[PDB]
Amino acid sequence: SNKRPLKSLADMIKGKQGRFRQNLLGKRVDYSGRSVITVGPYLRLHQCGLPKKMALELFKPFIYGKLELRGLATTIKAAKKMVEREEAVVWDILDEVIREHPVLLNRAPTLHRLGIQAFEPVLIEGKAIQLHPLVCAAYNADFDGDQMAVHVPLTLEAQLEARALMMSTNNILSPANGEPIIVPSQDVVLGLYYMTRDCVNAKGEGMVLTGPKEAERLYRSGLASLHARVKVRITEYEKDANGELVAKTSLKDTTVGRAILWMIVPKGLPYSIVNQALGKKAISKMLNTCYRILGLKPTVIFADQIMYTGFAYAARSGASVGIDDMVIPEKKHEIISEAEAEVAEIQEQFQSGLVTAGERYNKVIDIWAAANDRVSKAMMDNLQTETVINRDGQEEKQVSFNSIYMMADSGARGSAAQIRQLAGMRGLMAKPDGSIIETPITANFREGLNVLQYFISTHGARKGLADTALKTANSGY
Amino acid sequence: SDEADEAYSVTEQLTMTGINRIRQKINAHGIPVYLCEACGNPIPEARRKIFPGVTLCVECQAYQERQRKHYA
Amino acid sequence: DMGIQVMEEAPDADDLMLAENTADEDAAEAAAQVLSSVESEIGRTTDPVRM
Amino acid sequence: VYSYTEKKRIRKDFGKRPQVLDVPYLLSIQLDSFQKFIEQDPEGQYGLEAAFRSVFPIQSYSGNSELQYVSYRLGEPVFDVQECQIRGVTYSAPLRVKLRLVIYEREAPEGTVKDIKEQEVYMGEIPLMTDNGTFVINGTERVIVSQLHRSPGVFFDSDKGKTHSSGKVLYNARIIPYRGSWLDFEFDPKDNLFVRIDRRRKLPATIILRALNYTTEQILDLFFEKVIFEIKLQMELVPERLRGTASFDIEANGKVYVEKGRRITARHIRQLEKDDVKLIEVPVEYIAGKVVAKDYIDESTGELICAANMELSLDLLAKLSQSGHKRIETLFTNDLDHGPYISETLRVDPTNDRLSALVEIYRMMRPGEPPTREAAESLFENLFFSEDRYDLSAVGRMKFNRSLLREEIEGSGILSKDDIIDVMKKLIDIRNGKGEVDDIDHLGNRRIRSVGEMAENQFRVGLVRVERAVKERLSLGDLDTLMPQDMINAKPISAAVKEFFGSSQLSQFMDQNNPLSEITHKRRISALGPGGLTRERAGFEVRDVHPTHYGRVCPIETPEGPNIGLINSLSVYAQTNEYGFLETPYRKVTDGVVTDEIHYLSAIEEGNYVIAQANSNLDEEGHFVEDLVTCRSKGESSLFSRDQVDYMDVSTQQVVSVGASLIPFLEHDDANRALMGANMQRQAVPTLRADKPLVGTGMERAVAVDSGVTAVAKRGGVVQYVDASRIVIKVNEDEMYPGEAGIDIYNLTKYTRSNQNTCINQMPCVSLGEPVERGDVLADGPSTDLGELALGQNMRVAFMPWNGYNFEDSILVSERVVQEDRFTTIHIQELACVSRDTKLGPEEITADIPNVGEAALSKLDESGIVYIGAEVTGGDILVGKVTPKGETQLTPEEKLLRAIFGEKASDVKDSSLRVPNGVSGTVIDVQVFTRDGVEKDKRALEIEEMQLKQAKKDLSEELQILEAGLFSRIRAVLVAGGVEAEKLDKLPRDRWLELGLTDEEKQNQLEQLAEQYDELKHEFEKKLEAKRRKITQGDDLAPGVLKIVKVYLAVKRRIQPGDKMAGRHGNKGVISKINPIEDMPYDENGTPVDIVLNPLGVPSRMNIGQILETHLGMAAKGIGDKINAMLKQQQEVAKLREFIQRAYDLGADVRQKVDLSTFSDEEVMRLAENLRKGMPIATPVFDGAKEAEIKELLKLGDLPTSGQIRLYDGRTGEQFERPVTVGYMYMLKLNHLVDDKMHARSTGSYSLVTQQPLGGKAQFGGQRFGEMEVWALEAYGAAYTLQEMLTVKSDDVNGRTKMYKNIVDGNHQMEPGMPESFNVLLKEIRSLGINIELEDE
Ligand SMILES: [Mg+2]
Ligand SMILES: [Zn+2]
């Protein structure tokens, strides 16, 4: 009684609306539920903040069994009414039931098996699931409104499969390549970079501390600055043996933050692991060498301590972002005048029949790409260093503590290309066809774009977004 | 991911691959050929100073550009 | 069924590589042996109403 | 001069560019379009008149009868929009159509009619579009989106090399008609021109040129140039031809012109043209490759030596030469420019003449049938040149003539020979390199429909359906007494319009989140829908932004996700052509002077002009200040001299849409961030109390007013009486309309439910005895503030990491924002209790409910419904309903239980309406609907008497306010000339409509106003009577439902973790913590930061607009707090005037000017009190504040120019190193709430056929564990996890219950059995002829 065909037996089996496709594998499942994930940066790698209300719904039969086991509820109906009123002992029973009972957290595009991990629930107020920061890389989850589905293992065998097999502290290496998948992402690496990064003349230069404890006590009382090159006495333990762990103490030259951070590194790791700036790859390699020396328990502990200290010293960093942090180079309009002169000369030669049309197009596209490279190079050489004084009193160049640059150079977020678009010029823009519009964007974002350049950028922007929206459709083919 | 960061990567790849194609078509460093490979004519001095390493005069070049405009 | 997927518009370059190809080749032979013969008999029909 | 509601709070405005065209009425599309539809077109070409004229006059079988259309009108509806929404119907109007039937006898075909009959038959109801461009279709408010479909005309497009292996592009030209066949021409890979008629078999293109009665000589005359050789073997020369690689060298007069082998060049072309070379000589071998042009015969026998289009070889050269032939004509078939295509097509072309060509066409169209000369000719002439089978519409002919570059915008509707020969020449010219293809997303090929045109089409469909029945009924009998009421039943005419307005992809629920969302949803263009492309077939084609979108479609605003570029938003000043093509205004530029008058240009015209930029500085006389002004010509932008430029953009804003025009510093954001920011501004739910943006643009007042949320005055006057529910205005006497009573009333829309469960609620702004002028807002709508669009609240934001609490995109909100109720939103949701009649009897709304124990029934009144005033929680019974049922044989031990306790069975289910879980609101309202059979209950009679008293009070209170106003006007009439001024008040007010006065026209005025108040009285009386009839009359409830009780639960959602805040620059987040106020960062003055943000979000996401906005909001708030300090220490208005006037003129040559010197001393105190929270600031979209003016405005306050202050940690109190950026960013609460998302389930409902847990949160459903989650579980070893997700937690009906029993037993073991999905699969395979089975274990 429509325009569409009727569905038949062969249709009742085949097709994605058939039985095999999405009723024989993809099924709706009980003891489950989803919510909106938040950070919860205090958790450990093995736990997730479960809301009290989701936890009281999923673990309902377990709670009923507890109330009737402990006598707090005469029959299952009385327990039902208790946990319906949400009395005062249903909460103690929740704490007891949940105690060692993992929950599977899963996010929608399960591209790999790390899009499912067993976590121990930590009951929290509110209605958002709190997901560990170092797990977002596996989940591909940011905290701008994503949601997660929690499932509850029901059997002892599934409880032991979650604990023994899928627990978040077991899966830390990418199954595609054994590099650890617990790399700290953006506030963490910026914390560890800011603290592990010296400057030429800070408070307390060239003190000889007694060790990392004294460097921390000095910094926290504010007598020394977090990057003030001091001689510090370091005892590092090297398993250079049949696993014997010989100790060796010496006097290194490190910043105060280098030594404050040495307090968290476990025994088997050398001291050169923290004695440099510690951007992003430095931290991933730090976790990796800790794993190749010490194994899994020290590496999980190390990862948690790294996240904690990175977040703490990044908050103490006070690393904001301003408008004066986009240092547009002064030689930008000189370079653009020279490039504009070159395109005017090439257009004059083309008008005189010396070149063809497409030939001159190629020439001008090349001129603009080259001038864009000079502007980007000039701006990054302006941004990547700064002058400072000094023990004896003379000016001395050190790496810049500019904030946009510190974020791009610590590996925390950003890179010199987006930096170029922020303070250097924007460059030439594509079209959806792949052709290149030969009228460049000589402006940046610290300046503005006018209506025409903001229109021209829209071409490549909409093309990129239209592709990323459709790649999302067939993400897992 | 944010759905605009991946869009950024796509746009970056698109513009870069276009820019470098149109750059490779220039072949600035080259050989002094001094005479057209189509009509043997004298490639005038200015065209060899602008484009070091041309192989066609402007007439044969524009001719070839028309055809390669359509295709084949 | 051959199969070649008669479309209305030409497929994109990626849609050739990504599109799974099935399924040779017994049905290939059967389909070809039907198509080689269909061109000869003209009055052939399938509706019971036309018959 | 400033408006009186404008001096209340003046937004300081940067934006030096002076504004020339003021922004249009943003909803002109919907309202104009529906105006053209339902409106008396006298010279009928629009709307209903055109459809009626197109079906009528119907004429009967053999012309015995004629049904003739006289006229129409729209009967006024039964209920207005509010009554429609309450009652739940479509707010429409009856279409009463006066028709006429004339009947003819013998010998009078046109002759005298035996008799005619007039009658006004009623043909369906058309829905009425409200004053906002929205419809009410089933009580809900729809919006009909404008469509964007290809237009009739000729389109030149190529495969761009994808199809053929060599890459050779193949160009086709398609003539798409309005109705008719699709002529199409297209190249072969061999470059032969083919033509296909309806996507049918390919024929040679010149077959149709022969079908149009041409011969080969004529075809070659049309498509080619005749290189004429003469006689020896001399060649006439056109020097331009031999551009060049030159065959023969070149020579004339014997000396030389050019030597052979070397390519022909411009210098030697110059030489030939200069020396005047007409005749040169070529050998007998160069003529061996050319093509003969025309017939050539021997006079001796009259025999054909060579036809036309025949290759010319040396033998035929000799044969013609011996025939005394001096002249020879050859096709000028160059290889690059003048390619030979008609020649080769005539080679492949098997036919020769019009007969055989027509036969070929006939065989292709109507195949197999034996053709004739007559049948073939008739088919071909009926293809394109019979007026009743091929129509290029007015749009189609406009585009066909303009696309061929002709100056006849208007013309025929059928094709012609010349309209095909020009198409073929243009095709061949595109192939020759002169000319380009059409772009498909070009906005000169796509035109817009709207409600008027789509609804008119549906009405025409209904009219053709009517014509069928009327023709046949005038076929049978045609007997007298048969009138134009029995022939036309309104159902199938109204059926199409109903189906469209309700069930269509374009009729979609208006988004009411806030006013801006509605304004954008109405100004929306869609490529989808019936008539435009589908999501599956689109591309890759029209998702892309195109240069013709400038000024017409917003490049920013469009949804990201499944359809980018398929749903664009109309630009600010975009308009629709006469024909339907989008267009945009430009101020015309005479010689150098930028003239003032403005023309609208569409994407077809806009190319061939040179259009300056809106950001082009000018002298005062209108000249340009720059010699080379950057303007965009046809596709690109370059520097043109100031003499060349013809038009100039009307404004800097004219490229964006009204959504993306509300982003301050939009120029500093990456375009996709602007896309996200606009799309998220559409989603901001209105907070409890509005807060205007400290950094706006000046678009907010326009968006707030032009949408129907704020009640705007119609006439100036004084605010006679204000109230939380109504505003009464006593008009200025200049605007009285002398018949009128004088005062006009605005009734505010109090707490009501929008489509998204938000609260729409208008608040009065004015106060008693305060002036107003027409256009001033009286009532602030939901999410506006003193007339401006105020979406969220401006927060004191800090940019800094803070302990991993704003880590990926999270936000760290202070408890102080949670205390001030800044982001607290009132939500409203309606819950329906339907009592129907089941097959064992009806169900009651009683309060004598089963087992529930006299506490849950405490809220319920006697009739069983909750009180209006009660605060329920999740689980409370709103409406107690008990349902009949059978016995069902309670098992033993239940028998034994009830026998021991004597609690006999109920027989009646407790299927009542209890509040959903998690909600806790106040029950603000209860509507009841009893069918006319069901009598009524106590609550129903109570609510009816309450509505009765309200209706009577409203009518009388209106009438007495109006009576008092009219008596004031009458008393002002009675002040002179038959005057009583001191005894006028003596006699009673009712003894004034009989008041005396001298015999003037003003005693006429008194008597007139008196009898007009009498009109007020009597029409108030009929109002009361009709109101009581409607309130009392029974309801037309659905079939079977005895009565519907609707409770309206008003909840108040507060900010909490998991809620999604968001900025206007694509910076979205999710509150992760609600920090105590003493745990937050503070400055050196004791001021915590309200919200903490990640600085990491800004560099990678190139939207530094949020930083410039934070700086400007710091400056604005600094100004405003300095004002607050002055205003609180009671600094005199000398000080306030000085400082406020110094802050209102900051920045280099801004357009705005305010002079507080011309300001009443009380209007500076009001203005100061409104600027004491912060000085609002505007920053037009590509015109706003430069960073140096931000810095200056920071120096005006005592804030630092750098924008970064030094902050201290809340918990320890030790200063953060390297100061942080803190300013005021304007945050918005997006309608993605954490309690609309948090869902969970242990064990609930299970689906009927497939015994899985139900799907969704409304069904209390389970989670879809799909195929990829199964691969993830298999990639671990979790064999048991998977076996129970697939068996016990999903589908195994007998193992799920055993798992539950075991879990409450404290034994965690599953006996899984076998899934019901596989059992159903086995039975469904077994119900085919296959025998599938499970072997012995
Ligand atoms: Mg996300
Ligand atoms: Zn040459």
Q: Where are the domains of chain B?
A: 1-72
Give distance in angstroms: CA of D269 to centre of ligand 2.
15
Among the listed residues D279, D289, D288, D278, the one whose alpha carbon sits nearest the alpha carbon of residue D232 = D279
For residue A175, list chain D residues with Cβ-Cβ distance below 8 A: 1275
Which residues in chain D are contacts of C10 at CB distance < 8 A?
A: 159, 162-163
Chains that touch D (3 or more CB pairs under 8 A): A, B, C
Question: Chain B neighbours among D 253-312 (CB < 8 Å)?
Answer: 262-263, 265-266
d(CA A236, CA D592): 80
CA distances from D328 to D235, D284, D293, D295, D322 (A): 10, 13, 8, 10, 13
Q: Write out the two tokens for D879.
A: 């409406």
Considering only CB atoms, A359 lies closest to which of B9, B19, B61, namely: B61
How many other β-carbons are positioned within 10 Å of the β-carbon of residue D682?
Answer: 23
Alpha carbon distances (Å) from D568 to C25, D148, D549, D556: 47, 10, 10, 9
CATH code linked to domain D935-1034: 6.10.140.1670
Question: What is the distance between the alpha carbons of residues A376 and A365, in angstroms, rounded to a whole number?
Answer: 16
> Which residues 419-448 on chain D approach chain B with CB closer than 8 angstroms?
431, 433
The whole-angstrom distance between residue D643's C-alpha and the CA centroid of its chain comes to 39
Say how far apart CA D206 and CA D1028 lie, in whole Å: 77
Q: Which residues of D touch C9 (CB under 8 A)?
A: 537
Query: How far, in Å, CA of A375 to CA of A427, rounded?
Result: 10
Q: Report the DSSP beta bridge partners of residue D174.
A: D155, D184
- The pair of structure tokens assigned to D589 is 């530029």
End-to-end CA separation in angstroms for chain D: 95
Closest by CA position to D1061, among listed D1050, D1070, D1052, D1053? D1070
The second-level CATH assignment, the architecture, of D152-224+339-439 is Alpha-Beta Complex (3.90)
Q: Does residue D1017 contact residue D1009 with C-beta atoms inside 8 Å?
A: no
Cβ atoms of residues D1089 and D798 within 8 Å: yes
Checking DSSP bridges between strand A116-124 and strand A103-106, what pairing results, if any? antiparallel
CATH top-level class of D824-934+1035-1053: mainly beta
Phi, psi (rounded to 5 degrees) for D1042: -70, -45
Alpha helix ranges (H) inside A126-236: 136-139, 156-161, 187-195, 212-220
The annotated binding site of A for Mg(2+) is made up of 142, 144, 146
Q: How many CB atoms neighbour CB D425 within 10 A?
A: 15
Rounded Cα–Cα distance for residues D1295 and D530 (Å) = 48
What is the spatial distance between Cα A324 and Cα D47, in angstroms, rounded to a whole number?
60
- CA dihedral of D486, D491, D497, D503, whole degrees rounded to 10: -170
For residues A453 and A443, the answer to whether their CB atoms sit within 8 Å is: yes
Domain D652-708+784-823+1054-1237 bears CATH identifier 3.30.460.20: no
- d(CA D510, CA D520) in angstroms, rounded, equals 10
Going by DSSP bridges, is the β-strand pair D234-236/D226-230 parallel, antiparallel, or unpaired?
antiparallel
The distance in angstroms from the start CA to the end CA of chain C is 26
Beta strands in D182-244 (DSSP E): 183-187, 193-196, 203-204, 226-230, 234-236
What chain C residue is nearest to D165 in terms of C-alpha separation?
C13
**Which one of 3.40.50.920, 1.10.132.30, 3.40.50.880, 3.30.1490.20 gives the CATH number of domain A331-472?**
1.10.132.30
D169 and B71: CB-CB below 8 Å?
Answer: yes
Q: Give the helix ranges, DSSP H, for D989-1104.
A: 1001-1032, 1097-1100
Alpha-carbon gap, residue D1143 to D1137, rounded angstroms: 10
User: CA-to-CA distance for A11 and D916, rounded, in angstroms?
Assistant: 38
Alpha carbon of D14 to ligand 2 centroid (Å): 59
CATH 6.10.140.1670, chain D: domain bounds: 935-1034
Parallel/antiparallel/unpaired status of strands D1177-1178 and D841-842: unpaired
Residue D263 Cα to ligand 2 midpoint, Å, equals 7
Say if residues D161 and D146 touch (Cβ distance below 8 Å): no
CA–CA gap between residue A316 and residue A195 (Å, rounded): 10
Longest dimension (CA), chain B: 58
The Cα D449–Cα D580 span in angstroms is 7
Rounded-to-integer distance, Cα A2 and Cα C11, Å? 32
Tell me whether residues B71 and D167 touch, CB distance under 8 A: yes
In CATH, what class is D571-651?
mainly beta
Q: Which two tokens stand for residue D1083?
A: 């400055």
Specify whether the CB–CB gap between D143 and D510 falls below 8 A.
yes
Residues of D in contact with C8 (CB under 8 A): 537
Number of residue pairs across A and B with CB atoms under 8 Å? 89
The CA-CA-CA angle for residues D815, A147, A59, to 5°, reads 90
Closest-CA distance, B72 to chain A, in angstroms, reads 17
For residue D755, count CB atoms less than 10 angstroms from its CB and return exposed for 0-12, middle for 13-18, buried for 19 or more. Answer: middle
D224 vs D428: CA distance, rounded Å: 11
CATH 2.40.50.100 residue spans of chain D: 709-783
DSSP assignment of D688-753: SS----SEE-S-HHHHHHHTTTSEE-SS-EEEEE--SSEEEEEE-GGG--TTS-SEEEEE---SEE
Q: From residue A432, give the alpha-carbon distance in Å to each of A451, C12, D438, D673.
A: 19, 15, 16, 19
DSSP string, A371-400: HHHHHHHHHHHHHS-EEE--SSS--EEE--
* D1065 phi, psi to nearest 5 deg: -115, 35
Token code pair at residue D534: 């589908």
Q: Measured between alpha carbons, how far is D1055 from D1091 in angstroms, rounded to an integer?
A: 13
| A345, A359, A420, A436: best to mutate for the B interface, most B CBs within 10 A | A359
**Token reading at A164:** 């023994």
Give CA–CA dist D510/D515, Å, rounded: 11
Amino acid residing at D860: L
The span from the CA of D937 to the CA of D949, in Å, is: 18
Is the minimum CB–CB distance between D157 and chain C shorter than 8 Å? no
Closest by Cα among D1327, D1326, D1294, D1328 to D1311: D1294
- Dihedral pair phi/psi, residue D504, rounded to 5°: -155, 155
Closest alpha carbon to D492 in D472, D508, D473, D468: D468
Chains near B (3 or more Cβ pairs under 8 Å): A, D
Distances (CA, A) of A232 to A206, D189, D396, D402: 9, 80, 85, 84
> Which whole-number Å values give the CA distances from A236 to A102, A248, D144, D729, in the listed order?
37, 5, 73, 85
β partners of residue A116: A106
CB D1285 within 8 A of CB A151: yes
Per-residue tokens: D633 = 């010509």
Cα gap D620→D1060, rounded to integer Å:
49
The whole-angstrom separation of Cα A321 and Cα A405 is 10
Resolution in A: 3.0
Taking CA B6 as the corner, what is the angle to CA B1 and CA B8, rounded to the nearest 5 degrees? 125
Rounded Cα gap, residues D812 and D1092, in angstroms = 5
Contact D91, D139 (CB under 8 A): no
With H, G, I as helix, E, B as strand and everything else as coil, classify residue D1016: helix
Contacts of D18 (CB under 8 A, 6+ apart): D1151
Q: Which amino acid is at D339?
A: G
- For A179, other C-beta atoms within 10 Å of its C-beta total 15
The position carrying tokens 């200040």 is D625
* Bridge partner residues of D147 (DSSP): D449, D526
> What does DSSP say about strands D113-127 and D92-104: parallel, antiparallel, or unpaired?
antiparallel
Round to whole Å and give the CA distance between D457 and D375: 34
Closest CA to D1066 of D510, D556, D704: D556
D1272: helix, strand or coil: helix
DSSP conformation letters of D1150-1219: -S----GGGS-HHHHHHHHHHTSS---EE--TTT---HHHHHHHHHHTTS-TTSEE--B-TTT-PBPSS-
- Give the separation between CA D470 and CA D101, rounded to whole angstroms: 11
